[PDB]
Symmetry: D2
C-alpha cells in the first residue's frame, strides 16, 4: 500500500554481486569471446558458482526460488558486461519456464534438480524455418505411438541448443491443419542424448558471437510419454504463458546494454576535446546524452513494472510487451548514438561501442519482434475498451 522504488537488502546484495562479477570477470574478456566466437564456458561456470543462474527454479527442487524481478536486476547487470554471455545464461531460464509452470513434481525434480547439482544448460526449441513470430505455424509433428511419442521435425536459431542437456520442445499433435492452436500443439521436455537428434554448426551471426546458436533436426525421436508437460493438447498455452515471466527479463538485458552504451558514451564525451571544449560543452551532445539517459531511465521502470506485475500474481502481458518493445528500441538507439559520439574510434574495433551496436539489434527480433509486440499491446489495450 504505497508506491516504492527502493529494492530490498536481499535484492541489493544481488545487484552488488552481479555488478562485481560483470565489471570484474566478463567485461575484461568480453572482447575475446566476441572475436574468438567461442562459448564463454568458464563465465557460465562462475555465474553458477555465484548463483546468478537458474534463479527461478522452485526452492523445493533446491533452486534459489528468486522471482522475475530479481532475475531482471541481476540480468541487467550481466548485460552491462556482455549481452552474449548474458543471453547465454538467460537461455536456460527461458527454456525452463515451460517446465516450472506446467510441471508436476516428477518432471520438475528429475529435470530442474539436475541443473541444481551441476552447471548444465537447457534450450527452448520452438522457432523454426518458416514459423518464428508465428508460433502456431510450426510443422514439427508429434505422433503418439501408444507407450510414448514420436517426434519428426526441424528447429532453427536455438540458443544454447548445442550445449543444452535437455530441450523444451513444442510440436503439433493434431494432424488436421484447421485444428486450433489451443488443442493442436503439445510440448515435451526432451533430453538431448536421445538418438536421431542431429545438431547443426555454429551459425555466424553479426552479434552475440559467444552465445551458442544453431539448428536441430528431430527425425524419429522417441519421446518418453511421462515427459509431456501438461499432456497432449496443451502445448501452445504453456509456451505462451512461459515468457510472461521472461520478456521482462529480456528487456532487462536490453536496458543493461543501453546503460553500458550510455556509460562509455558519457565518459568519452567528458574528455574528448573538439573546437576548444569538452564534447559535453557542445549542446547537441549534451542533448544527446540527456535523451539517452531518460530512455535508459524509462526502460528500467518499464520492466520493473512488468516484473512486479507478475510477481504479485498478475498477467503482466500488457506491461511485459511495453517493457520489451521500449527497451528493445532504446537499446538500439543508445548503442548507435554511443558509436556516434565516440566518432571514428566508435567504428574502430578496439573500442566497446562497436560491439554494443551489433548486439543490441537482436532485441527487436527474438522473443517477440517490435511489430508483434505492438500487436499484443494493442490487442490488450483495445480489449480494455470493448464489451
Amino acid at each position: 500500500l504505497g508506491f516504492s522504488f527502493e529494492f530490498t537488502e536481499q535484492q541489493k546484495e544481488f545487484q552488488a554481486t552481479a555488478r562485481k562479477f560483470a565489471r570484474e570477470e566478463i567485461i575484461p574478456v568480453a572482447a575475446e569471446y566476441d572475436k574468438t566466437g567461442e562459448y564463454p564456458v568458464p563465465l557460465i561456470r562462475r555465474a553458477w558458482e555465484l548463483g546468478l543462474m537458474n534463479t527461478h527454479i522452485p526452492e523445493n527442487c533446491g533452486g534459489l526460488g528468486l522471482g522475475t524481478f530479481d532475475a531482471c536486476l541481476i540480468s541487467e547487470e550481466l548485460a552491462y558486461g556482455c549481452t552474449g554471455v548474458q543471453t547465454a545464461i538467460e537461455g536456460n531460464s527461458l527454456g525452463q519456464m515451460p517446465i516450472i509452470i506446467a510441471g508436476n513434481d516428477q518432471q520438475k525434480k528429475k529435470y530442474l534438480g539436475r541443473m541444481t547439482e551441476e552447471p548444465l544448460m537447457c534450450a527452448y526449441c520452438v522457432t523454426e524455418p518458416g514459423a518464428g513470430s508465428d508460433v502456431a505455424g510450426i510443422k514439427t509433428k508429434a505422433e503418439k505411438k501408444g507407450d510414448e511419442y514420436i517426434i519428426n521435425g526441424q528447429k532453427m536459431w536455438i540458443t544454447n541448443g548445442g550445449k543444452a542437456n535437455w530441450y523444451f520442445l513444442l510440436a503439433r499433435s493434431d494432424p488436421d491443419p484447421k485444428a486450433p492452436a489451443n488443442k493442436a500443439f503439445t510440448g515435451f521436455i526432451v533430453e538431448a542424448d536421445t538418438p536421431g537428434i542431429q545438431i547443426g554448426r555454429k551459425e555466424l551471426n553479426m552479434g552475440q558471437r559467444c552465445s551458442d546458436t544453431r539448428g536441430i533436426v528431430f527425425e524419429d525421436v522417441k519421446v518418453p510419454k511421462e515427459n509431456v508437460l501438461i499432456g497432449d493438447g496443451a502445448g501452445f498455452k504453456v509456451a505462451m504463458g512461459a515468457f510472461d515471466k521472461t520478456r521482462p527479463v529480456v528487456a532487462a538485458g536490453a536496458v543493461g546494454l543501453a546503460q553500458r552504451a550510455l556509460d562509455e558514451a558519457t565518459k568519452y564525451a567528458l574528455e574528448r576535446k573538439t573546437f576548444g571544449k569538452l564534447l559535453v560543452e557542445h549542446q547537441a551532445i549534451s542533448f544527446m546524452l540527456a535523451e539517452m539517459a531518460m530512455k535508459v531511465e524509462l526502460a528500467r521502470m518499464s520492466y520493473q513494472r512488468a516484473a512486479w506485475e507478475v510477481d504479485s500474481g498478475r498477467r503482466n502481458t500488457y506491461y511485459a510487451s511495453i517493457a520489451k518493445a521500449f527497451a528493445g528500441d532504446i537499446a538500439n538507439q543508445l548503442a548507435t548514438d554511443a558509436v556516434q559520439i565516440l566518432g571514428g574510434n566508435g567504428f574502430n574495433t578496439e573500442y566497446p561501442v562497436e560491439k554494443l551496436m551489433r548486439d543490441a539489434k537482436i532485441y527487436q527480433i527474438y522473443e517477440g519482434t517490435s511489430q508483434i509486440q505492438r500487436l499484443i499491446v494493442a490487442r490488450e489495450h483495445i480489449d480494455k475498451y470493448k464489451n
Copy 2:
C-alpha cells in the same frame, strides 16, 4: 522495502473523487469554457469544495497536508477533463509552493490560512516580457526602504494574475550586475489589492483558453518587509525550490491529457469503419494505438517516480525534469495522433481531439521548455560521472 506499484487505499478514494468530478462535471462544460474563454469559476469552486484544491497546505494551517504523489494522482485526473481548468486549479498550488517550502508560520498562517477559509487564487510571478527560461536575469526592481521594499518591474503570462488575491514575486534586489543570481534576487508575497499594481488584459492563447493568463506591472508597489520569504538574496533559492514539488504535477497534467487523447482515439477506432473494416482492424491504427498507450503508461511512471522521490526525502531534480520533458513531449504526440485517428472530424471543433492538440502545446513550453529540461537532465547525469 521492495518495489510496489500499488497505490495506498486513501489514494484510491482521492482518485475516484478527482475522477468522478472531472468526468461528471468538468467535461460537459470544458468546451463552453473553451468557446467563450470565460474563467471556470463554478468548477474551481466545486473543486475546492470537493477538496481537490490547495492539497499542499499543511494540517497546521488547516490544510489536507497532502504530498506531491497524492497531488499528482489528483491533477492527472482533473487534466483528463480539461487542462485549461486543471491549470487554474494548479496555479494555486504552484504559487503557494514557495511559501509552503520557505515560509515562516506567520506568513504561512496568514496567507495559506485564508486560502482554506475562502476559495481564492494566488499567482507565481517570475517570467517577464523579455525574460522567461533565463530566470537568473528577470529585471524587476525591488529597493530597500525601511520596513518595506519598493517594486518597479514588469511580468507577463501570469497564470491566475488578474484573478489573484496575492502573488509570489521574484524581483532583483542587489542592483550590481556582478551579483550572482544566488544573492541577486529577493522573493516575497504581494497582495493584489496593493495600489501601484496594474493588471493587464487577458491574453488570448491557442489552448487553455479559460485559464487566466495576462500581463501585470508593479508601479511603486510597497511590500511590507515581513512579507519577504527568507531574506535579501534568498529569492533565487526560493522560487527555484518550488520546482522539485511542482514540476512532477505538470507531467501528471500532461499524462492526463495524453490519456484523454488516447481514450478518444480508441473509442472512435472501435466504431468508424473504412474499407469494410473497423479502424482498429487496420494494422496501422492498431500500431498507432499500441504506441499511444506505450507512451502514456511510461509517462505516468515517469512522474510518479519523481513525486515519490521528493516525498521519500531525496532530491528529485533529475527525475522531475525527465517526467516534465518526456510527458510534455508525448502529450503533444498523442494529441496530434488522436486528431488524425478521427480523420476529418478530428479537424472539426465539435470533437474533443482538436481541442486537445491546442492545449497540449503549453506542456512543452511553460515550467521550463523541453530544451531547458534536457539541459537539467544532462546536467544531473554528467555530474554523477564527474564525482
Copy 3:
C-alpha cells in the same frame, strides 16, 4: 535533356507576382480573416485579377493553360501568405480538374469558360459523412430517369461548398452492390442553383477557418446527362485520375506553410536572446533551424519532381503521394517547431506561428490521408518487384 533545377523566365515572373501578392496583400489581412473566419472575397477576386487563379483552364476556354509545375509554384507563394485563403483558391482547380481531363469540348467551354470571365468558385463533391479515404464506399444515388439522372444523398466537408457556382460530383450509378468501383460510379457537373440542393451550414474547424467548408444534401437533384463526364460508370476513373494532377499542388501548399514557419521562427531566432547569446546562437536552436531547413528543401523537390513527372506526361502517382506524404508530415513538424522557438510568445494569438500549427494539420488529413498515401506508395513500390 540532362537534369536542370533552373526555372524559365516566365515561371520566374509568375513566382514574383505570386510573392508580391502573398507578401503584400494576403499576409497583412490574413490574421484578421482567421479571427473572423470570414470568406476572403477581396483576395479571391484580386488573385482572379492577377491570374493566380484557374491556371489549368486550357487557352481555348480563355484560360492560362499552365501545367502542374507552374501551378505548384504559384501555390507555394499563396500558401505562404495563408493556406486558408490559398485552399479557397486551389479548391477551384480541384473541382475543375475532372472537367479538364475528362470533359468534352462542349462541357469544357461552358463550365470552364464562365470562370474565365467571372471570379466564380466551384467545388469537388465526393466525400460523404461516412466515406472519405474509402472513395468506393460512397452512397449518393444517381439513377437514369428519362434523359437526366436523379441524385439523392449527402456530401460532407466540401471546401467552397456554400460558395460554388457548380460542383463536380461522384455518385453510385450501379445499384448492384457487387459492381466493381472501376465501372460502378458516374461523375456529373451539377449547377448549384438546381432545385433540391440544400447547401449545409458553414462548418467550424481548427485551422483554415476562412475556407468555406460545409456539407450538401442532394435532394432528388436532377442533372442532365449532358453533364455526365465520359459515361455512366467512368466517374471513379476521373476522380482517381484528377488526383495525379492535384496532389502535387496540395503538397506545394504544405511546403508553403512550412516556409512561413521557418521564416517566422528563424527571424525571431535572430532578435531574441536568452543566457546572453541570441537564440540562434544556442546549438540546439541552430540544430532546430538546420533540421527545419532540410525538411523543406526536400519536400519542395518532392512536389516539384511529381509536378514535372505528370507535366512530362508520365505516371505521377508514386512520386506525388511521396510528396503529399512527406510535405504533409514535415509541414506539421515545422509549424510546431516554429511555435516552440518563440516560446510563450509563439503560443500566443498575437503571433503568426500559432495559426500555422492549426493550419498544418489538414495537410495530413484532407485529400489523401497520410496513412493511405503510404498505402498508395507501398502499392506502387512493391509492384516494381512482383511479376
Copy 4:
C-alpha cells in the same frame, strides 16, 4: 530554362555500365572480401578498366573529364554492390580533388597523368588522432627548410593509407597558434615512397572491412616546394574547396546502400509469409517499405541537387551539406529496417542485410559528421536572414 529530371543518353550509359559491373561482379565477390577483410584489388583494376574510377581527372591529363553529377551517378551503382569496395574507389577522387581544383599544369600532369596509365591509388590525409571534425585543430607541422618543407606529425583513419601512391596532406605551417586557419595551413602532394613515411597496421573496423584505413606517421618527410598546391597559408582554402565537389559523391554512396537495403527487404517481403500471408500484405511491414522508398528517393534528389548546383558553377555547400546529412541518416535507418524485415535471418551473417547495417554507420562519421553537417546547414541558412 525549365526543370528536368531526365538523363543525358551519355549518363544512361555510365549508369548501365556501372550497374552491370557492380551487380554482376561486385555483389558476388563482395561478401567474401568483407569476411576476409582483404583489399579488393581484383575489383579495383576492373573498375579502372571500365573507366569509372578517376572520372574527375581532366581530359588534358588523359582523364574522362566528368562532372560531380556524373561521378555520383556512377558512384551509387558502385555502392549498391559494396560501399567497402566503393569507398576504396572514392579514396582516389578525394586525394585527387584538391589537386584537380588547385594544382598547376605541371602538377596536374605529373600526378593525375599517372592514375591515367596505371591503376594506382591515392589518399586523403587530414584527420589526426586528436582532431577530425575540428580540421583547424591539426598539429602536423610544415617547417620551411630551403627548397623543401619538413612534415612532422600523424594522420589517422586514412582510406587507402598503405596502398596509396601519393597523398594529399594538409598541415600547419605558421607555428603561431593565433594564425587564422584560412592562411595558416599548407596542402602538399607527398609521394608515398618517401623515406620518413611510416604506415601502420590496418584498422579493423566494424564496417567496410575491405577498404584499408590506416594511421600513418611522417618523420622528417622532406617535401619539395614544387609540390605545394597554392602556397603557404592557402592549405585551408583548397581543403574546404574540395568538400564541395566530394560531398554529393559520399551522399551518393549512402543513397546507394540505401537502395541495396530497400531492394533486399522488398524481395524478401514477397517470399516470406506469416499468419497466412506474405509480409507485403501486413500493413506494418508495407508501411516500412513505403517510408523506406520515400527516403531513398528524397536522398537521391538530395545529392543530385547538390551535384547540379556545383556543376552549374554555384556554391553547393548548402545543398551538399543537407545531402550528406540526410542521405547519411536514412541510409542508417534503411540498413536497420532491412535487417528487421528479414528478422532472425536478417541477423544472420549468411544474409546481406546484416552486412549493410555495418558498413552503413561510417556515413554518419567520416567526411564530416551529421552534427557538423547540421552546423554548416544552420550556418548557411542563417546568412540568408541578416542584411
